Amino acid sequence: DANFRVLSQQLSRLNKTLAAGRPTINHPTFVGSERCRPGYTFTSITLKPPKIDRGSYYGKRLLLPDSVTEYDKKLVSRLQIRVNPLPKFDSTVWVTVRKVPASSDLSVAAISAMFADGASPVLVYQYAASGVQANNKLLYDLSAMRADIGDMRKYAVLVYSKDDALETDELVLHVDIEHQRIPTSGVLPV
Amino acid sequence: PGYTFTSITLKPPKIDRGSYYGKRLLLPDSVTEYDKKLVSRLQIRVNPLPKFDSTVWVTVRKVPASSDLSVAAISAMFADGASPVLVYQYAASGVQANNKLLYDLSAMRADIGDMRKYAVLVYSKDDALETDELVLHVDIEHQRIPTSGVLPV
Amino acid sequence: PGYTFTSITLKPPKIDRGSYYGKRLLLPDSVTEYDKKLVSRLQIRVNPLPKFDSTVWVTVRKVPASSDLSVAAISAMFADGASPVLVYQYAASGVQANNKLLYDLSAMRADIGDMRKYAVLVYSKDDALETDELVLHVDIEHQRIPTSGVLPV
Amino acid sequence: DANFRVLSQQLSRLNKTLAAGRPTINHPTFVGSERCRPGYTFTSITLKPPKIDRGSYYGKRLLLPDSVTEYDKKLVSRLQIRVNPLPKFDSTVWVTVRKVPASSDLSVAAISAMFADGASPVLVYQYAASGVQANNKLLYDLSAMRADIGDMRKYAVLVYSKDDALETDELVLHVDIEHQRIPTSGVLPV
Amino acid sequence: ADANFRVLSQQLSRLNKTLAAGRPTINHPTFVGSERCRPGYTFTSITLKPPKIDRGSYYGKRLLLPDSVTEYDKKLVSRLQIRVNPLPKFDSTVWVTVRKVPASSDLSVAAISAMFADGASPVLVYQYAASGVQANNKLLYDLSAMRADIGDMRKYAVLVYSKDDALETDELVLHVDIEHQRIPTSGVLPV
Amino acid sequence: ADANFRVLSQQLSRLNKTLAAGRPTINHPTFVGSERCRPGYTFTSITLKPPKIDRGSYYGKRLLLPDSVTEYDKKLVSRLQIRVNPLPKFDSTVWVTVRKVPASSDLSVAAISAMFADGASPVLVYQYAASGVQANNKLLYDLSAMRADIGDMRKYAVLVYSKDDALETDELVLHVDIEHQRIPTSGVLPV
Amino acid sequence: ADANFRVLSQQLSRLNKTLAAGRPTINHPTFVGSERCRPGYTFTSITLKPPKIDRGSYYGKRLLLPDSVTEYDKKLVSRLQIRVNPLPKFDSTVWVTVRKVPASSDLSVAAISAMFADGASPVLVYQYAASGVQANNKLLYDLSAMRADIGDMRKYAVLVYSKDDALETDELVLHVDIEHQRIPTSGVLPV
Amino acid sequence: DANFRVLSQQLSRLNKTLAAGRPTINHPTFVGSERCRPGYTFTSITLKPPKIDRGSYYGKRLLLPDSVTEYDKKLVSRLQIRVNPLPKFDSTVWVTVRKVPASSDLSVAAISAMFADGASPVLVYQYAASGVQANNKLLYDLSAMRADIGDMRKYAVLVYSKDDALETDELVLHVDIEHQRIPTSGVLPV
Amino acid sequence: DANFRVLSQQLSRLNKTLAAGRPTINHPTFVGSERCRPGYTFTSITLKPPKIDRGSYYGKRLLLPDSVTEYDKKLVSRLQIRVNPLPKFDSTVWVTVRKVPASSDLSVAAISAMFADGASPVLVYQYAASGVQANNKLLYDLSAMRADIGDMRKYAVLVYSKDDALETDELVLHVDIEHQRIPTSGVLPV
């Protein structure tokens, strides 16, 4: 009665925390996702860079599929970076989800300056001969800002191949975005 | 109730004068994974972009023999006259009675997996139905999509 | 209520230009054994498969004199104009007002046995009505089929 | 009061059992059917073999009329074999309703092996000059398996003429199938 | 004896009928006995005589009635009965059946042998034995559930099949006994 | 209904089984029906094929089992069963017996005909008749009193005797159905 | 202990499973142990053998079943499992995945490497190390929320990828263990 | 309460009586034995006649095995005749268990006179081509006379082959005797 | 009072689980045994293979010492594999405790097929220059099957040297078996 309740919420924090990243049998290599919030669903984006040079920076503005850009009032809870590696891979990548002011600036070599301030978390990923890296999944949160789908144009993902010019089929990227449900029909279609 | 109107737009390629056409009901794969879900009534719609001057004998049912091929053997299948047929020769908004028909399955409950066995069968009669003249629509009714509660892994 | 819609599909054979046709109402034998059952309203429907270009003067009533033969003596029977007639010269889904008429018998209660005495009478006017052009439908209403509780012996 | 009730159910078993097969005046030669269950109705199949050879085996998969194959979700309570003899008859037949795995095997001369295991009851029928055999009606039950009309494709009837090549008009066969009511209309037909 | 022995008495009375279905009782030692007519209804017989059909030939026959019966074509028909009484000189075989032919919707030529096959009605066989005369030669086809009348008795048709011989007209008689209500009584002053 | 109709209900239920021991019931019209397996136990079949022994020759055969069954040789055996299923071409005669041979204490050469004589076990005959196929071809030998197990099923031996013919291998199949407990269920993570 | 220690007991029992997710326990010191089958369901294995595909080649394979399982295609499937058991001579690498291919809507030619990219399913890697054998080689993909049956097991497809070598057929076996309900028990008298 | 008890004993008589001889599935050809009484056990005798002539009478005095003849005070409840047929058999036999006065008379052709009086039941057995005879088991009762094992010498079995001289291996006979338990040991053996 | 009791049993699970394998000071290199159950004792077997070839499979049926094989009714709780390494060791071994059907099959090269099904846990052991492997002790449980000492003949241990032909003195094996107490004497010996 409101005394074991606060103790139960303390221990449930430790169950999440002590199982942050360990090779659990439900997903033994790559770290598992967290559950979508009741309400919201997800929506993916596969972005393909052009063949940029060896060790070159890369800028990319976030667009969306056009069925999503209709309802530009619904909120965006969190967004996600998946970096799924296909087998032939020896390179390194850094991924970042910073806020570029929209069309206030370019993306030419000031991107390497944008890695320096650290206003956002930075996802590294590197090849090891010892084994594949277990943790390749960043979650950048947005629930405090109450942003919407209409503000998703403002953000920009920043990619950096370092030790190689990235071949277009050595490592795919993804930007998964969690927003509310696209509104359901039910009217008589004409 | 509990339904979000799944639209599939399937345009048929080019016909000659007095020739048939068949095409099977292939759906998006977010729907096909919901194979158990009960399927209510369905309808078709014929929306022409202008440059249109033609008329059609569109009718859809299950193709027998588990989807044997659908050219010139549906000529016997248009010879029965069991289900009604939509004939569009009006070319003005309102002169046509209706763009739509009915194929209810509430007692049948032929599911999403049974939509693999259905095939739109098309007859054309005039002008051989050149490019961009009509845009066929087929709208189905089937119990509401359960969304995943897990972000991609 | 209490009724399952008994459909009988009777296509008429080939006519000449300006000739009549008659055919009696024969039903499936699972229905004819239910002779006592009360019969409500009935209707006809004209569904053409395409290749169709014709028009008809379909009208059904009881043939008198206990089914005397039904060629060229129904020309006087189309000369009265008592019951309405369906004329199909539209050839598009919705341009026609209606494919259906009405012959209610709720006060008459002319039973299943009295369906032996009815005869579809057909007039054709254009194109002599060649093969597979129209598929006639006639749908009746009559108290619900009692199924047997005994497996075959 | 719940004491003669159990005695009444015991004696009613004996009324069925002691009248299993006797030439009752309601049906004096062939054994009578049992009543269809409240709910279910029946549906017949007359199967006609091709002219197979003298003493040859015979396989046949169960199909249905196409009006039945629509509602392939409704249950099948029991199925029945009638072997009605027409007058000119001197031969012998064996009928069996086994479960063949669907398209996992052929039906060529392993059918005589399928008579041997005895996983299903076997209906014999033979001519006698002493008189016509009184019992020519097998009931194979299916209420425990909760099978449907969609599983009726899986079964196969196995026929064996023994002492003769079967003429097509010396003995008819039937497969009567008891399933639920094909769903009633009541909508305004168009 | 208060609604608890009553249900036990109705169970045992079923067994008295059932265990005495066919046995050579002393009240009728060779042919199986009839059942009692229902209170109300009476009976009415028909002797039908086929023409000399060929050896092993099928035979169709529509049910007519005597004309005094065909007047009151509204009264119900409870059950009908087939008696096959054998006269002494007999060695042949017969099959009798009481099926529903759709009235004038079809003929009776050699599709009768197809009508034996479906089994929608019970089939009465009868055959000679040198071991003795067959004890059971009496079919009762019931009609109380359909609520048919005398006016529907035209629709039925009896189907006869001599098998091992061409039937001589005086080797075996047939009968169709029909149980319907009482033909209405007079009592008016006749003129 | 308080411990006085209970004993009367158990008496009448004996008569329902007994008076329906063998009669051509519509659920199985020719061969006698099986009895229900006990809650718990399941069954397991054996088809045995003799070599072509001579005309009227005896035959011995020890009971083996499939090797998946011989693992759990501690579980009990409730009853065992003989099915003799006839295929159509058949005119011969067979006798089947389920006696206890002492295991490897003796041979099976022509003392088998002496083993038919003592009658310590029931003997299933089966013979062809032109009058018709024999309705009863199913022996049940009980074992619930001895509390034997699957490990003792090696000790028994089935004894077959073709009499009027040398048995062709495809005129009549035999079976030995054995009712024992459930082979133990898995549920562990397989590796 | 009244609905207040009950919720605390369920919290700590989560930590006993979680803190013992993978550690070399003495009950199974090298390969991670299975979880217990649910009360009800049993298991059924499949050993799949690829043809000799090339070095670093993709591989597609549709899930079939043994034919005794494909009979009862109405019973549910709780979970399915991937075991990758290594035999000793092994230096290669494999990736195993249990994705949903739409049934006969597409081929399996080199779009399989695209199917690794979306990440709608967990991906089991396995690689040789000279430091030692990898302790975790057992994926469990769950299906209890979808209420799928045995009849839907045809729709799934396992995706294998040898990477650093052309896979010899006897360097590493694969398995697909499937947990579904009990195949229905007999108990009827066998004929 | 002592009113359904007498009704239960009436119906249990009918269960035995209506199942006197019918081919039950527990023993389908030869009629089954009855249960030994609590107490008593059984003891068998196989008797082998010499090759007597065609249609000849046969006398045989009842002896016992010598382990049984020790305790000649214990009672004899009932005795039994089994006539087990081996396959090659076409003959006929009559078996009878009469009381011959011990050494007061011979057994030469007055045995056929001993069949005539009918003071004991007579078991016939005959071959039929229609099938093997189902009933081949006589039980002669002795519980009223209170005889013992010492009086079993007085009885004599009477066999009559009729249609053939009996070959010694066409049909075996048996005399099964139900008496009390031969007394159990338990002393320290020396 | 029956509420801290269930919490105490939850935490005691975590004390075992979080101390599954760690280098505790009571046994710093090889993982410790678990306590024998009250009742049962243990019994060892050292098995010595012949010099099989390089990378060759190996089969071996479980026998026992003859003093144990007397009381073949007593139960077997669990059995154990110890793989004790002596110093000169660079090879690799796999050990498995599968159920071979007794004399139903050989052990020639189908043993490598028996590794594939995974019906039993598989103990690997490999040399590392980084250090000796800490976990070399499999426990296969048998308490659910209620097997006895008489069924220990049915099992077979499967050994596989992989990278070398095993010298007979580079690595010993053991099979420790936990069964009940061999029955105690106390009678006056003669």
- Is E179 within 8 Å of E80 (Cβ atoms)? yes
Task: Please list every residue in chain D whose beta carbon sits closer than 8 Å to the beta carbon of residue B84.
Answer: 190
Question: CA H174, CA H30: separation in Å to the nearest integer?
Answer: 15
Supply φ then ψ for residue I27, to 5 degrees. -155, 100
For residue A17, give Cα distances in angstroms to A13, A139, C121, G12, G18: 6, 16, 85, 14, 11
Nearest to D185 among C4, C150, C153 (CB): C4
Question: CA G15, CA I11: separation in Å to the nearest integer?
Answer: 9
Cβ <8 Å between I101 and F184: no
Length, in residues, of chain H: 190
Listed residue (D94, D92, D82) closest to D127, CA to CA? D92
Listed residue (D91, D92, D93, D68) closest to D79, CA to CA? D68
Give the number of other Cβ atoms within 10 Å of residue H158's Cβ.
21
Return the exposure string of E23-32: e unless at least 16 CB atoms fall within 10 Å of the residue's CB, then b: eeeeeeeebb
Which residues touch E25 (CB under 8 Å, ≥6 apart)? E33
- Provide the CA D175 distance to its chain's centre, in angstroms: 5
Rg of chain B over CA atoms, in angstroms? 17
First to last CA, chain I: 57
Question: CA E140, CA E83: separation in Å to the nearest integer?
Answer: 9
For tokens 């071959």, name the residue: H127
Question: DSSP letter at E56?
Answer: T
Listed residue (B55, B62, B77, B138) closest to B102, CA to CA? B138
Which residues touch D64 (CB under 8 Å, ≥6 apart)? D43, D45, D149, D152, D153, D177
Q: For residue H3, how many C-alpha atoms fall within 13 Å in the half-sphere facing its CB?
A: 3
Nearest to A185 among B5, B99, B151 (CB): B5
Which residues touch H18 (CB under 8 Å, ≥6 apart)? F15, F18, F19
CB proximity under 8 Å: D 58-77 to B: 70-71, 73
Question: CA H47, CA H64: separation in Å to the nearest integer?
Answer: 11
| Cross-strand partners of B47 | B135
The alpha helices in F21-135, defined as continuous H runs, are: 112-115
CB proximity under 8 Å: F 128-167 to H: 129, 136-140, 142, 161, 163
Cβ <8 Å between G118 and A44: yes
Listed residue (C85, C27, C50) closest to B84, CA to CA? C50
Question: CA H137, CA H80: separation in Å to the nearest integer?
Answer: 7
Supply φ then ψ for residue I49, to 5 degrees. -75, 155
Residue of D nearest to C145 (CA): D184
- Is G28 within 8 Å of I140 (Cβ atoms)? no
Chain D within 8 Å of E116 (Cβ-Cβ)? yes
Give the number of other Cβ atoms within 10 Å of residue D182's Cβ.
17
| Residue E185 tokens, joined | 């009584």
Listed residue (F89, F84, F175) closest to D57, CA to CA? F89
For residue E32, give Cα distances in angstroms to D19, D151, I172: 17, 46, 93
| Residue B116 tokens, joined | 């693999």
| Residue I154 tokens, joined | 């049915």
**Technique behind the model:** cryo-EM
For residue E186, give Cα distances in angstroms to C77, D135, E41, E66: 46, 51, 17, 19
- Among left, alpha and beta (phi > 0; psi -120 to 50; other), residue I2 is left
Cβ <8 Å between D71 and B107: yes
| Cross-strand partners of C106 | none
For residue E178, give Cα distances in angstroms to E9, E48, G138: 31, 13, 80
| Residue E49 tokens, joined | 């005589």
Question: DSSP letter at E184?
Answer: P
Listed residue (D190, D183, D185) closest to D70, CA to CA? D183
For residue F74, give Cα distances in angstroms to B13, I19, I20: 72, 38, 35
Written as one string, the DSSP assignment of chain H is --SHHHHHHHHHHHHHHTTSS---TTSSSSPPPPPPPSS-EEE----------TT-EEEEE----TTTSS-TTSBEEEEEEE-PBPSS---EEEEE--B--TTTS--SS-HHHHTTS-SS--EEEE--SS---S--EEEEE-TTTT-BGGGTTTBEEEEEE-SSPPPTTSB--EEEEEE-PPPP--S---
Chain C within 8 Å of D29 (Cβ-Cβ)? no
Listed residue (D174, D182, D32) closest to D97, CA to CA? D174
Chain F within 8 Å of D85 (Cβ-Cβ)? no
H9 by Cβ neighbours in 10 Å (0-12 / 13-18 / 19+) ranks as exposed
Task: Please list every residue in chain G whose beta carbon sits closer than 8 Å to the beta carbon of residue B25.
Answer: none
Question: CA H157, CA H175: separation in Å to the nearest integer?
Answer: 9
**Mutation site for H-interface testing, chosen from F125, F134, F136, F177 by largest number of H Cβ within 10 Å:** F125
Question: CA C121, CA C81: separation in Å to the nearest integer?
Answer: 13
| Residue F150 tokens, joined | 């699957």
Cβ <8 Å between G191 and D99: no
Task: Please list every residue in chain D whose beta carbon sits closer than 8 Å to the beta carbon of residue C5.
Answer: 185-187, 189
Question: CA A95, CA H42: separation in Å to the nearest integer?
Answer: 95
SS3 call for B132: coil
Question: CA E143, CA I117: separation in Å to the nearest integer?
Answer: 67
Return the exposure string of I148-182: e unless at least 16 CB atoms fall within 10 Å of the residue's CB, then b: bbbbbebbbbbbbbbeeebeeebbebebbbbbbee
* Helix-strand-coil split of chain G, %, nearest 5: 10, 25, 65
Question: CA F98, CA F166: separation in Å to the nearest integer?
Answer: 21
Q: For residue F125, how many C-alpha atoms fall within 13 Å in the half-sphere facing its CB?
A: 20
| Residue F113 tokens, joined | 């005909």
Strands G58-62 and F124-127: unpaired
Nearest to F119 among H25, H26, H82 (CB): H82
Listed residue (G191, G189, G180) closest to G63, CA to CA? G180
Question: CA H98, CA H160: separation in Å to the nearest integer?
Answer: 13
- Is D60 within 8 Å of D72 (Cβ atoms)? no
Strands D137-141 and D76-82: antiparallel
Supply φ then ψ for residue D152, to 5 degrees. -70, -15
| Cross-strand partners of G124 | G96
| Residue A141 tokens, joined | 């949160």
What is the resolution in angstroms? 4.2
Supply φ then ψ for residue G184, to 5 degrees. -65, 135
Task: Please list every residue in chain C whose beta carbon sits closer than 8 Å to the beta carbon of residue E121.
Answer: 153
* Residue D102 identity (one-letter amino acid): A
Question: CA H112, CA H57: separation in Å to the nearest integer?
Answer: 7
Chain F within 8 Å of G25 (Cβ-Cβ)? no
Question: CA B68, CA B73: separation in Å to the nearest integer?
Answer: 9
Question: CA H7, CA F8: separation in Å to the nearest integer?
Answer: 9
Question: CA C37, CA C48: separation in Å to the nearest integer?
Answer: 32
- Provide the CA I24 distance to its chain's centre, in angstroms: 22
- Is I153 within 8 Å of F71 (Cβ atoms)? no
Where is G125: in which H helix or E strand?
strand G124-127
Task: Please list every residue in chain I whose beta carbon sits closer than 8 Å to the beta carbon of residue F71.
Answer: 99, 101, 154
Return the exposure string of A126-150: e unless at least 16 CB atoms fall within 10 Å of the residue's CB, then b: ebeeeebbeebbbbeebeeeebbbe
- Is G188 within 8 Å of B71 (Cβ atoms)? no
| Residue H36 tokens, joined | 């030994």
Written as one string, the DSSP assignment of E120-180 is SS--EEEE--SS---S--EEEEE-TTTT-BGGGTTTBEEEEEE-SSPPPTTSB--EEEEEE
The alpha helices in A18-92, defined as continuous H runs, are: none
For tokens 């133990």, name the residue: F184
- Provide the CA E159 distance to its chain's centre, in angstroms: 11
Question: CA D181, CA C80: separation in Å to the nearest integer?
Answer: 45
C72 by Cβ neighbours in 10 Å (0-12 / 13-18 / 19+) ranks as exposed
Question: DSSP letter at I149?
Answer: G
For tokens 């009791």, name the residue: I5
- Provide the CA G12 distance to its chain's centre, in angstroms: 28
- Is G177 within 8 Å of G44 (Cβ atoms)? yes
- Provide the CA F79 distance to its chain's centre, in angstroms: 9
Question: CA G62, CA G155: separation in Å to the nearest integer?
Answer: 8
| Residue G145 tokens, joined | 């929320």
Subunits with at least 3 CB pairs below 8 A relative to chain D? B, C, E, F, G
- Among left, alpha and beta (phi > 0; psi -120 to 50; other), residue E5 is alpha
Chain A within 8 Å of G12 (Cβ-Cβ)? yes
Written as one string, the DSSP assignment of F104-156 is TTS--SS-HHHHTTS-SS--EEEE--SS---S--EEEEE-TTTT-BGGGTTTB
Torsion of CA B106, B107, B109, B110, to 10 degrees: -110
E66 by Cβ neighbours in 10 Å (0-12 / 13-18 / 19+) ranks as exposed
| Residue F28 tokens, joined | 């199985």
Give the number of other Cβ atoms within 10 Å of residue D14's Cβ.
20
Length, in residues, of chain F: 191
Question: CA G74, CA D76: separation in Å to the nearest integer?
Answer: 14
Chain F within 8 Å of H168 (Cβ-Cβ)? no
Establish, for the pair of chains A and B, how many residue pairs have beta carbons separated by less than 8 Å.
48
